[PDB]
Amino acid sequence: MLMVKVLDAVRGSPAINVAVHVFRKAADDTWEPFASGKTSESGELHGLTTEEEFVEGIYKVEIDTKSYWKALGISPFHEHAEVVFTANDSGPRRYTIAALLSPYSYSTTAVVTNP
Amino acid sequence: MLMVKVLDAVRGSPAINVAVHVFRKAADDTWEPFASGKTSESGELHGLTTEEEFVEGIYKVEIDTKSYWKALGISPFHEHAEVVFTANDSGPRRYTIAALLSPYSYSTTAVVTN
Amino acid sequence: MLMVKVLDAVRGSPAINVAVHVFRKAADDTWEPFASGKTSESGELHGLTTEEEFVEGIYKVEIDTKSYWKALGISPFHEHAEVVFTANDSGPRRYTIAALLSPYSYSTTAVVTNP
Amino acid sequence: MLMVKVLDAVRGSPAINVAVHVFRKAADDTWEPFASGKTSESGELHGLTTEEEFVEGIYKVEIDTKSYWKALGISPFHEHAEVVFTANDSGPRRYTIAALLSPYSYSTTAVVTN
């Protein structure tokens, strides 16, 4: 129900092997680890969660942009990119989180569809 | 030495009266309040820090995008936008953090000049 | 070999039924009509061209953003979004042209892969 | 009354010495040169027009992005970036056309203020 897609705006390609960590805000206001993975050769990350597991709450997706640029020999500005949102508060939805990466800039977009 | 600029991509205007909070990373890996304010009529926020207090370290700029959209009666996706970066003395000195806001998308850009 | 994808950053959804016109620069420096279509319900447009037809040259993709926003009751800034690029100059490639639309802003990204 | 600002997203800096050409649509649906220049050290271009010459109509701003990237030795995708818009007297008066450049992506934003 949660997919992450990452593009490289410098090379015009998917961002491959980018680490992604997802957290869920617990009842005590701390960030609990929820899921993690790495983008595939198409720059996508699927299978982070199931419908039963993906309950209502506040989630944070943290994308390790810094390691990505370093391995390409570029010293980027940001430590990472994070996306924080409330999910499922009016029923289950499919969430696609897209990120477009440049060394000193990034964009993030959400596409939300009703399964 | 740190300047924040916020633009509204729906109305083509500065994003006015947006709350901004700046944090510095402490030794215990905790975020401590450092500065804050609200963007002006030109969507800018200046005078958050001085060259003396702005030492090397990791900083987080949090922009309350959700309240901005709610005031316009538009339902947004993100809870806020966060920009996290390391400040380095070698060797460019002025940091402009720009943010371009839409309800389901934002971009942020850093302009670092001397 | 040419695909166009359009997203709506105001609604968090694909941009559906957006008109797209593609032109190729002729030998006399004029823009010849090459192909056209409308984005589907996933905001995508496939099948604009074939490999035999998609020769080396300069192409322009014009996306009718203005009609899209008007039909939603918004008066946008731009007349359209156009993307102009040289294609296939070092052999056939697959081109994905992505556009992210807001009323007073747009972004366009190209993903180029080797078939 | 028309201002162009260009930023480089790879180096986090103003895009300096970028060529900009502005055209106005003629009755024959043809584009006629109207103004031009090169961005300054702050990546800005001012004084392209006056309030008197800037009448209602359709304008095209063409930014030579390809030459900018080539000078840095980076191969870009686009031939240039074009921004086409209608200017309207009712009723906000100053137009800032911003562009944020990467080799395979650009964004453009209009800020229209009074």
Curated annotation (Swiss-Prot), chains B, D:
Gene: TTR
Listed result of changing residue 48 to H: In AMYLD1; amyloid polyneuropathy
Disulphide-bridged cysteine pairs: none
Consequence recorded when altering residue 23 to L: In AMYLD1; amyloid polyneuropathy
Outcome after substituting residue 23 to I: In AMYLD1; Jewish 'SKO' amyloid polyneuropathy
Record has Signal as a keyword: yes
Effect of residue 61 to A: In AMYLD1; amyloid polyneuropathy
Phosphoserine PTM sites in chain numbering: 42
Impact noted for substituting residue 99 to T: In DTTRH; increased affinity for thyroxine
The protein, known as: Transthyretin
Phenotype upon changing residue 40 to I: In AMYLD1; amyloid cardiomyopathy
Domain notes: Each monomer has two 4-stranded beta sheets and the shape of a prolate ellipsoid. Antiparallel beta-sheet interactions link monomers into dimers. A short loop from each monomer forms the main dimer-dimer interaction. These two pairs of loops separate the opposed, convex beta-sheets of the dimers to form an internal channel.
Organism: Homo sapiens (Human)
